[PDB]
Amino acid sequence: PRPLKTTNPAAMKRGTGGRSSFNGIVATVFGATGFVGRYVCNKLGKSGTQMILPYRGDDSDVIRLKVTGDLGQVLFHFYNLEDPASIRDAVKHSNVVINLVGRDFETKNFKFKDVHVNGAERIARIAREAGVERLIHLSSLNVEANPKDLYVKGGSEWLKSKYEGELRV
Amino acid sequence: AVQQVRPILSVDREEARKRALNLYKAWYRQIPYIVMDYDIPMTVEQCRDKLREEFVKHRNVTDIRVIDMLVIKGQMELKESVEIWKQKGHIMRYWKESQDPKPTDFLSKFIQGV
Amino acid sequence: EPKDIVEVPKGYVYVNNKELSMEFADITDRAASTMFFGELLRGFAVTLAHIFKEPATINYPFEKGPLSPRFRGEHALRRYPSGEERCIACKLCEAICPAQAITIEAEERADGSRRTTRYDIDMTKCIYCGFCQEACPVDAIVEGPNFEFSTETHEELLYNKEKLLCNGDKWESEIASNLQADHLYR
Amino acid sequence: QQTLPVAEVAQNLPKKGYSPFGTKQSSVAEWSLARLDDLLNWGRKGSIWPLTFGLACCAVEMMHIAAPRYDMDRYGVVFRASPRQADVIIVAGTLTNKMAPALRKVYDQMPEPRWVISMGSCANGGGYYHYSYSVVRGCDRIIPVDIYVPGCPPTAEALMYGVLQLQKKVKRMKTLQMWYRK
Amino acid sequence: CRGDIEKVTHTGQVFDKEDYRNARFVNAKRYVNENWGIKLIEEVPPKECTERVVFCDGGDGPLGHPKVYINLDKPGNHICGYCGLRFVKK
Amino acid sequence: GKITVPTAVNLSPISGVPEEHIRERRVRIHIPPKN
Amino acid sequence: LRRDVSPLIQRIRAFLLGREHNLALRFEDGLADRTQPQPEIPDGPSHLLSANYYCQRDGRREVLPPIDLVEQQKQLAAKLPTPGKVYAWD
Amino acid sequence: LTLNFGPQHPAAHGVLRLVLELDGETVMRADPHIGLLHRGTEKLIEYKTYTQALPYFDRLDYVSMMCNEQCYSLAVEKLLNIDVPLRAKYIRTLFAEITRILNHIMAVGTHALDVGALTPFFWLFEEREKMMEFYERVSGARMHAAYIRPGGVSLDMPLGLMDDIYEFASKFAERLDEVEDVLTTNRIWVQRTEDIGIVTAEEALNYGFSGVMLRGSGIKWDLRKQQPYDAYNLVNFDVPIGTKGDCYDRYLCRVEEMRQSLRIIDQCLNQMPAGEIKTDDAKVAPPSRSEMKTSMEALIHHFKLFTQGYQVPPGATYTAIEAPKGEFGVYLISDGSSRPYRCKIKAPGFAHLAALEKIGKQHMLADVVAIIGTLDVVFGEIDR
Amino acid sequence: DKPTVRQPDAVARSHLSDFGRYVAECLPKYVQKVQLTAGDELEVLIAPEGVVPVLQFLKDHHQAQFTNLVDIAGVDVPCRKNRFEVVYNLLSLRYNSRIRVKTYTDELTPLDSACEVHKAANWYEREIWDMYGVFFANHPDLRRILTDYGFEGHPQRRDFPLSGYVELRYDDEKKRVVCEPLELAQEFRKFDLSAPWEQFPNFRNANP
Amino acid sequence: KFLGINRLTKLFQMVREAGGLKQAYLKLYRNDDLKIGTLVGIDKYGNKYFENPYYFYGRNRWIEFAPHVNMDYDGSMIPAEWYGWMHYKTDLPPIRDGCRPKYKWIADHSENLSGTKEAYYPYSTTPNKVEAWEPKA
């Protein structure tokens, strides 16, 4: 018997399943401006899920996601990955946190460890401290503890970073 | 239980079935031009399967004026499909895209509230 | 003076009814207007004379164009001079609202008044027609002078009771002046 | 809200300046990217070219900012017929069910950056045909909208107020600072 | 901390801390009117009258509420149902 | 030029009603109550 | 006074226009006053206190159902006909 | 070459989809696709009362506002057997003529933008903004005034409105002459407007043409004189009649309509009676606010007529007045309740646009652009 | 004197009454009933088999040149056996008059197209077909003129809902404007504006 | 004068009335046209309202906003009492008109706060209607 958290009858599941309905899920899709984020935002908005949607860059890269949900089901929030208080402000009223934060190349501000390892662990521990019921995190298929190079030297840092980030999550 | 009315586009059920077969023949000939001239994900075989499904959906009807009404609306949709007035979104309205399949069992409808 | 092709009656006026002139003076005049662009010269002169005219550009937003005391803008909820809110929850405005933007939910207050618990106007649904202020028995709902209330976000145009009461508090002087200068017309 | 500052209080306040970021950046590269973004936003807000997208009555007021009294041309604003050459699309009218793929295709062929102004109650929220069988309930379900101009036929001062609010949004755009912090 | 979220309105409404609907106020201000009508109508004094029936207009004639007549034979304060002004007979 | 038809027809295919509304909706025929 | 050019540019503009130019923009002295005294609306025909009954002037209740023109001749009987006067539009 | 003059295209009014088949520059076929601005007006009228369905007509043909409100008001008044006062008749006549000039300014500016001369568009839209300021003074909105009501007008005229209308109408004729100095008898405008879209008399009679399309071809039919309405029989004016039936004769007829509307405006400001604005049947018109806040029967009638509409007797009528586009008709059928059972709108632009398939054949592309420029179509009332 | 009551025009009453008896005498096969309504408007109530031969007659006769056809109007009254009625409004410029020709039509039963008589019926008879499903036989092309290309159903029937059955929204997965079942954010508030007291005693027994 | 030489000294006295040449430069850079007018009003917020009937209608009255803000001005800085004066509803300024209420509960004017972190966001104003049952008590 799985118990309910708050039993607020303005917060339970209602409706048939369109945009105007509510399925009792408050999603916080981190990195929702990306490739998987667009499809998961439209799939969440077609069912009636309110999304908080924290964005890091400009508002023009994230303002296209207002057409996925209904009125009031789409929010926006400015955050940095190194800043923990903004993440705690983002996930303080949520029960489902979806983590799509990842980067295929090293950046001058964020390395692989600063995105996949440290950032996902920080998001997971902030969501655990904020009372989030469920967290969804994405990794790679071929993650190993010590993955070997095949063609390029210095490769498979991404797979090791995703495996270490999954272990810290 | 019998009234005398003015026939619309037919005088007998065999003639109405023959004109429905004309409609199906013209739709079947217009399938590969619809797949070619529209930017739709559905292929030729999927379009033919959808055409067969929409015909066997209306298989159940019996009345001459009702089946002639269906033939008239089908020819109007076909004329909207030969001359390209419908869009790629109007063609893909036959396949129920962006719609979650509603369950038929009582337990899933009881959990979801339907 | 060219002759009439069709005889013009008393109650009508005819355009392109003149005969084409065939005397040599009019043919030479039309020929010189064709060859030397005389009518185009008149059009160019009429065009060039409007450069020297005063520009009608009213230089927004330092200088704003004329309005009227009857002007329909942002809906707002007024108050009595004593301070009690005017809206007695009588729901003629929602009954008369043609786009059905107004939603009213009313309960009895602690002292026994009729005043609302919910008064919402969807300004994305409101057509600014002014039927609510005519159908208001007290002068509660009113069309304020404000029209510079463009919003960045769709939900911010869903006006609550507190937003309408804040609009009534903010715009009370101009609304009261317009209602003082306009009540005898209505 | 906030109370607008009294002139006794406001005389002690310093001048705001043109830049919303301020000239108090620490790094010289951050300051250079801030001034480059200020110049880029000045060039973008100095000329936005809206598209001739007039669906219904609201557009009769849209030509009234073309009109000599209000004169949109001294704000960088001039109409362009082709969607490639245009920055802004002004949804001025009633978006219907047959109008939806045309508006979506015209918006998708427009090149990015793309700011959208919803002009009028039919453009945002559906309005006076909100319960109609063949009217889309606002254009926010199809095209992402940055400015929403409220009036049923917006006065032309209010449409130009939406244009100035879009210019303030364009002046507040942070691209190179976000690139430095990405 | 922000004190504009937990502040109650004049309709007795506040979003509690376990509600999901307070996430809409993390980037926008919650608008609560500080001019309540109850205190602003309790602040005015009652009007003393000598005649048995009185009329309340609420202000100016065409700019006030429709005219009502209140009977002041019962002891106590009689409240106008339109404006909320209280009359009393000595 | 007249034909023979039954007087009871079914106009549910030629109308715009979907299957999910024609298969499970109950219609109440009633006199409305006096206030 | 009015905001206008010097008379040289005035005569150049009047020569290029081909007519005597009048100003196309309104001015404050050439317009009506924005503030103005309150009006009184005159009463109509039925605002008299005496001899006004509604049934004598009842517009909605004098509407009858349409007359069957075939049966009107049958119940009243117990130059070709035109639907109107001839208008010459030529 | 199949081609779409789609809704983006500026010669189209923003929702017209002309699917045209072209052999070179000539137009072999032209099928107009409409209903891109269909908003379901007639489905939405039946769920609302009469005074709630009054602002639909402002949005139907939106360059003829007061004419549409006048036509709906005459429909409801003919159903109710209610006679408006003379001051209301003169106010509605003056605002219908102001509306006629506004519509023909929009027609001339749109046709000149489609042909190419973009200067008289702004030259006349300054004048159009001055009349929209007049609408704003009299009602409170620059357009969709909601000012003409069944039973008269909603509000009285403000003081000193005619003291601005007279100065404006005195100044309008020089602007008219300045427009004809650049548009009339310019040879390029003649080459884009002469012998183009020739409509014969039997064409306009059989194809349901009305208004200027009747009077371009030579038919002397003006509905303000044949079937008079709202003090149009107490004013005197001339009717512009064309001969050739091309775009030039229709353009000259429209500018001559703007010229004759000035003398109708002059007569309306010259004679205006001092009296009431609404009919005094308080069960069909809302009472004054002083009577509503003072008397009991006026408060009851204000309450009733602003909750559930006035009971129109059951019956059918079809009124039709002279719109600036043509003949604007309301077929209003009432079942005796507070809501109309049926309100069918005859727009003249629908019947004008229905002959575009025959007129546009064997014409060029700029010919067809000038034809929609001279057809004077507004697709809000066409799509209804 | 009553100045708040509209006075009828007697010269538009006598001429229209004589013409109504004239058109009842000239066409007894099709005309069932002619009636002069309040507001001085003449209605002719024809059989559905006489749509073309009546509207041709009023087009081409010397005593009735109703050469202009302003509008064809469909009214859906679902109580009757033949639910739709079709109203042709004709204007006579020569005699300066108007007539209304009304017929009854069911959705399955076709109607004669007046496109051979008046060419405005090329489009107006499409519009009723787009809004009621009244099939007009021997029409040039009977297409869908006002509603969307993928629209299923006729919207102006009283058995059709006000908000429709479906809505449209942009799907960025399919990259197109897709069709969804209807869910309104705020429902249409149906107001019960019914009069419990009758106000017209002249229309009490107007049904037989 | 016939030629128009006397408008040059009007431009010169515009420059001197602006406060110099640099102040006239920043007045022309900020206010899009240079004008002279009688100072009618000064707000509590620091705006200045000038009127001069020499210009035509629609341009004879202008606001110059408070000098603590540059480039962030908009049309919502005008308060409620001067809104009818700037929009030609009345011809009476609040310094002469006494018809304005000036009540105690009148809130001060605020600009359009949309697009910032302090804008208005709607919410349900009624409390909860259905009260649930708590197994406790």
Ligand SMILES: NC(=O)C1=CN([C@@H]2O[C@H](COP(=O)(O)OP(=O)(O)OC[C@H]3O[C@@H](n4cnc5c(N)ncnc54)[C@H](OP(=O)(O)O)[C@@H]3O)[C@@H](O)[C@H]2O)C=CC1
């Ligand atoms: N081929 C694939 O797509 C595969 C993906 N995955 C995993 O799936 C997940 C999602 O992938 P996908 O959407 O396709 O990739 P993207 O790179 O396209 O999206 C990543 C998202 O995270 C944001 N982001 C990136 N770096 C940071 C940072 N340092 N701080 C905060 N936000 C940041 C991006 O924002 P912005 O808009 O600024 O770029 C973007 O919204 C990732 O975890 C990835 O490792 C695994 C296997 C295969």
Ligand code: SF4
């Ligand atoms: S009509 Fe006026 S008093 Fe009545 S409910 Fe509406 S706003 Fe309140």
Ligand code: SF4
């Ligand atoms: S102005 Fe009209 S649309 Fe707006 S709230 Fe009032 S009645 Fe409704």
Ligand code: SF4
């Ligand atoms: S919002 Fe109002 S003015 Fe604009 S298109 Fe709709 S009805 Fe017309």
Ligand SMILES: [Zn+2]
């Ligand atoms: Zn009181």
